[PDB]
Design a protein around this ligand. Structure first.
Ligand code: ZN
Length: 66
DNA sequence: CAGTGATAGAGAC
DNA sequence: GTCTCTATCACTG
């Protein structure tokens, strides 16, 4: 079990990010963090990966329910 | 239960 | 005062 950590540490092949709320994918099958998957897919052009950070800003949450 | 697409908000200068 | 990037939500099988 354990998986080599995550056998092939889910590491953004685009920005090395290891921490992320969810993992995205690309029609090529390469693993990507949510930011690159969201930004890369929406922009379609290379991006200064220098924007990435090891800290993620926590936003609020629409407390659904009743 | 998990993942995707779409929209909106906040921060900095 | 304005722009941008990123995260979360809702929905479905
Ligand atoms: Zn990434």
């Amino acid at each position: 079990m354990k998986n080599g950590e995550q056998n092939g540490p889910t590491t953004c092949t685009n920005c090395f990010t290891q921490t992320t709320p969810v993992w995205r994918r690309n029609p090529e099958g390469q693993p990507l963090c949510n930011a690159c998957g969201l930004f890369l897919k929406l922009h379609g052009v290379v991006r200064p990966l220098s924007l990435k950070t090891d800290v993620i800003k926590k936003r609020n949450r629409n407390s659904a329910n009743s």
